Design a binder for this molecule. Structure first.
Ligand SMILES: *[C@@H]1O[C@H](CO)[C@@H](O[C@@H]2O[C@H](CO)[C@@H](O[C@@H]3O[C@H](CO[C@H]4O[C@H](CO[C@H]5O[C@H](CO)[C@@H](O)[C@H](O)[C@@H]5O[C@H]5O[C@H](CO)[C@@H](O)[C@H](O)[C@@H]5O)[C@@H](O)[C@H](O[C@H]5O[C@H](CO)[C@@H](O)[C@H](O)[C@@H]5O)[C@@H]4O)[C@@H](O)[C@H](O[C@H]4O[C@H](CO)[C@@H](O)[C@H](O)[C@@H]4O[C@H]4O[C@H](CO)[C@@H](O)[C@H](O)[C@@H]4O)[C@@H]3O)[C@H](O)[C@H]2NC(C)=O)[C@H](O)[C@H]1NC(C)=O
Ligand SMILES: *[C@@H]1O[C@H](CO)[C@@H](O[C@@H]2O[C@H](CO)[C@@H](O)[C@H](O)[C@H]2NC(C)=O)[C@H](O)[C@H]1NC(C)=O
Ligand SMILES: O=C[C@H](O)[C@@H](O)[C@@H](CO)O[C@@H]1OC[C@@H](O[C@@H]2OC[C@@H](O)[C@H](O)[C@H]2O)[C@H](O)[C@H]1O
Ligand SMILES: O=C[C@H](O)[C@@H](O)[C@@H](CO)O[C@@H]1OC[C@@H](O[C@@H]2OC[C@@H](O)[C@H](O)[C@H]2O)[C@H](O)[C@H]1O
Ligand SMILES: O[C@@H]1[C@@H](O)[C@H](O[C@@H]2CO[C@@H](O)[C@H](O)[C@H]2O)OC[C@H]1O
Ligand SMILES: O[C@@H]1[C@@H](O)[C@H](O[C@@H]2CO[C@@H](O)[C@H](O)[C@H]2O)OC[C@H]1O
Lengths: 449, 455
């Protein structure tokens, strides 16, 4: 059959993980389910044995005065009157139900990567006096305010949000201070040029470093709405590459189809079929909402976009568009996972944080392949099969060390009939033989003893 | 103060008490079986008799993991590997289970025990990363434990189910089932290392295996018999995803004490404690030392009132040897059995606080008295009085708020102390109030009985 030979001596990017968000009170929607529904939603998102095994949670650092509509209330919703005054913190022990989701992810399911991102400063820190409708942080170049220079205050505020999480037994590992900085919206939004982002990183970095935080989070930038948009910010960011450690971008205004010129890992932090009528299907005709489509979208972001992580926009939510992976039926108190959840899971269950992408060769026409060596030495080989059932042999290169060689193998597939379902893996003399199902994503894993 | 009045408020309730007990694992049951017939009967009586012994209501058995009965090892029902987990397991039943089946049959059919907790300390060696039931190692096929020989997770679930079926076919119902013991500890004897995450992983496999089995009674899954409260409490977060698939939290009292309530929806049992290394003593009170009956009466109190425990098991019941690892001493040469006052301390609880009792509020204790109260399923109310002072005149009553048909029509009392082993004392009863002289340095239990069916 087809023989796929993994070359562990040819390496690419590290994989930090896969995930999603419950921002904008999507966590509050989850919190209103019955106990059994809450548990099923958390399980299908985070379970490493019986769900998607998502390894990254992205939270919003709320900017709004209250929890009206779907707004994320800020930890400091009321102005202290001057940026020279201590901020007025009113920690509610909830953070828009994101603290609960985070505690479950970390303490119940073993998630270790928590990305907190502000879509805006509080309104009193901004040129327009409002967390919505754009505007900029007071005190940046070209943004003087009568009320004062709020740059250090905003750095102190973000540091305090991370401290509140720490005191609630959750370590925020990555910290963002803008989202879609190129776009004014009717909801939480804030306009920074790439230059202003560099200016603010020079203030935020020493604030974190001098803080009493147990773990100093890595600063991220800038959650632009597409690859091209974020790539256009990298020149101005290059002066501060010693002071941040993660580039973030979405997949809306352009696709993750090229390697960005940055020394940092690059995460694709939001993608979705936002407008698409709800479908739970794996494959029907290759539509934009189909699980098969999203298995390939992830492949493309990793192999062509050089992404180290891939986050779907929203995990569990109500509504009937493909903006989310897991449908909440608030009436029945029920939870329905789409095959998009299982697409992201077919990746995340087997390609764990700290994996290194490695060369695989031998694929035929109708197979797209990628390989990853996990920190534990397990070698996950992804096979996306656009044809009929295919006999595939998976092995390491001749030149592989005996300590890298597998003593056992397993395989799982997602297709129309399967949700990360274990399939037979014949194992003889370092070689795993699997029948990759028609129109499936199959992951074959080679385990050392 | 016409004595100290203890007033029970039946409207204020706490946890249920499932019972009190011990184990005869690691061939301690074999040591009992070697006694002359009268010695066997005396050992069984002092453990289980509800009239003339400690009335222990729970037995904890080991699910043997060893390839043979060398040393004190518990031989497995499946000591020989089938080579591969695709192959049916090879069951080699000996009709004995390291003499635990006999102790169980006597407990259930002679003495009325209804709760039988079977716990594996290891899978058989051939199912593990180290190929041995001792020296730790992990079940093959769990996350972080892939084995050349295969994935033995389903096999181990099938094996545990089959152990329960062999008991069922020998007319004993296993009510509770554990699959690890001290999962944080590697030892030179039966031992197996699981993280809390691995335990949750295995529960997701074991639960449906039990539910689809042909067992007459589906036992409740327990976890995880950690060596202390702190160690077990640290496992609860990873276990919380499978709270719909198990029903009992278990922990020991070695590496920390049962001094706080665990955050779990399940009943919590303290399934092993002992003065393991203390020189044998049979005494109730000498100075408050680690082996004394008085100290163990207080350890039970603390586990129930401060630990929120629903059950309390001493490590071993009857055993040979010269330490306080056990409650009842066997002299294999004399063929004799000698209960310590630790046996009588646990019986001073278990005789009167029967399975299903609900802990209830009691007020009025003076400085020398520690008190707790329990409403039994039959409406009888057991009031424990632990008295560190001289003889204490005490009155025991229900709160005036009580329905007149909850109010006792009779009362009895028993005490354990340096001279008494669960000995009846006077409970003078007038107009719903029991009056007792609680002896110096004793544990006394006063029971208020409603009239019930009696004219
Ligand atoms: C000290 O230790 C105590 C334990 O020893 C501990 O007590 C525990 O307290 C918590 C918190 O108060 C209690 O949690 C509540 O539980 C309610 C359900 O309780 C009933 O079901 C339980 C589980 O039953 C399963 O397991 C048993 C054995 O495994 C079986 O006997 C059962 O058949 C059943 O098995 C089935 O299900 C299993 C999975 O669960 C499955 O594996 C199995 O195969 C099978 O299919 C019982 O244990 C419990 O029994 C108690 O109560 C009965 C009746 O009084 C007694 O007779 C018993 O002796 C025993 O004491 C019950 O039968 C939940 O409903 C409740 O959740 C609701 O409320 C919360 C908020 O508190 C809401 O967030 C939630 O959404 C729920 O809301 C619903 O109900 C409310 C009504 O109040 C309503 O307003 C709302 O709209 C909605 O409808 C909560 O989870 C827990 O039960 C206690 N345990 C026990 C054993 O009592 C105590 O806290 C400790 N103290 C301290 C200080 O820490
Ligand atoms: C893909 O992304 C990785 C980062 O995830 C890039 O790795 C960097 O490569 C440069 C140039 O060789 C090194 O000096 C950096 O130290 C690397 N960063 C890390 C964190 O490893 C890699 O260059 C990217 N690939 C392409 C084709 O652009
Ligand atoms: O510029 C026009 C484009 O269509 C954008 O609006 C798209 C792609 O860049 O942007 C996306 O719009 C929808 C956003 O979702 C919402 O977030 C706020 C919340 O209150 C709403 O309920 C959501 O619909 C998404 O964040 C954004 O990337
Ligand atoms: O880590 C060191 C500690 O002292 C542990 O050894 C203690 C308390 O955690 O653990 C206890 O050690 C003795 C064990 O009893 C033995 O069980 C196996 C049997 O073969 C032996 O004869 C017994 O001594 C006890 O189970 C354990 O809790
Ligand atoms: O490894 C396999 C798991 O991936 C599988 O998980 C299931 C995925 O589909 C969901 O609908 C189920 O709830 C979940 O259990 O279970 C089998 C296991 O071998
Ligand atoms: O109710 C009382 C029993 O608890 C008591 O049991 C005795 C306890 O001490 C043991 O040494 C004896 O063998 C045992 O009979 O017996 C008297 C009864 O009133």
């Amino acid at each position: 059959g087809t023989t796929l030979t993994v070359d562990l001596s040819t390496t690419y990017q590290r994989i930090d993980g896969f995930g999603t968000s419950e921002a904008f009170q999507r966590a509050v929607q989850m919190s209103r389910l019955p106990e059994e529904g809450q548990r099923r939603a958390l399980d299908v998102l985070f379970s490493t044995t019986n769900g998607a095994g998502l390894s990254i949670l992205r939270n919003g650092i709320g900017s709004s005065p209250d929890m009206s509509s779907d707004h994320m209330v800020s930890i400091a919703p009321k102005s202290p009157g001057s940026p020279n005054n201590p901020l007025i913190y009113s920690w509610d022990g909830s953070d828009n139900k994101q603290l609960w989701v985070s505690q479950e992810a970390v303490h119940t399911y073993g998630v270790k990567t928590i990305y907190a991102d502000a879509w805006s400063a509080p309104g009193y820190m901004k040129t327009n006096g409002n967390d919505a409708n754009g505007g900029t942080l007071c005190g940046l170049s070209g943004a003087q305010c009568a009320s004062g220079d709020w740059r250090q205050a905003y750095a102190d505020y973000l540091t305090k949000y991370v401290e509140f999480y720490q005191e609630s037994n959750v370590t925020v590992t990555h910290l963002g201070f803008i989202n879609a900085p190129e776009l004014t919206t009717s909801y939480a939004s804030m306009r920074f040029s790439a230059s202003q982002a560099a200016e603010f990183i020079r203030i935020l970095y020493p604030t974190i470093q001098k803080s009493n935080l147990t773990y100093k989070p890595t600063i991220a930038c800038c959650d632009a709405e597409g690859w091209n948009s974020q790539a256009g910010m990298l020149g101005a960011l290059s002066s501060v590459n010693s002071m941040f450690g993660l580039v973030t971008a979405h997949a809306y205004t352009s696709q993750p189809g090229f390697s960005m010129n940055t020394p940092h890992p690059v995460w694709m932090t939001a993608a979705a079929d936002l407008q698409g009528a709800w479908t739970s299907a794996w494959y029907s005709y290759g539509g934009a909402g189909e699980g098969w489509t999203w298995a390939n979208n992830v492949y493309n972001a990793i192999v062509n976009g050089n992404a180290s992580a891939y986050l779907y926009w929203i995990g569990a939510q109500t509504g009937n568009t493909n903006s989310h992976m897991v449908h909440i039926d608030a009436n029945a108190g029920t939870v329905e996972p789409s095959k998009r959840l299982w697409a992201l899971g077919q990746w995340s269950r087997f390609v764990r944080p700290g994996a290194r992408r490695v060369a695989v060769s031998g694929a035929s026409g109708s197979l797209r392949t990628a390989a990853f060596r996990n920190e534990d030495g397990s070698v996950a080989v992804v096979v996306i099969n656009s044809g009929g059932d295919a006999a595939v042999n998976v092995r390491l290169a001749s030149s592989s060390s005996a300590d890298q060689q597998p003593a056992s193998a397993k395989a799982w597939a997602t297709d129309n009939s399967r949700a990360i379902e274990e399939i037979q893996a014949s194992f003889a003399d370092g070689v795993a033989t699997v029948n990759v199902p028609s129109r499936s994503m199959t992951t074959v894993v080679l385990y050392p003893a």
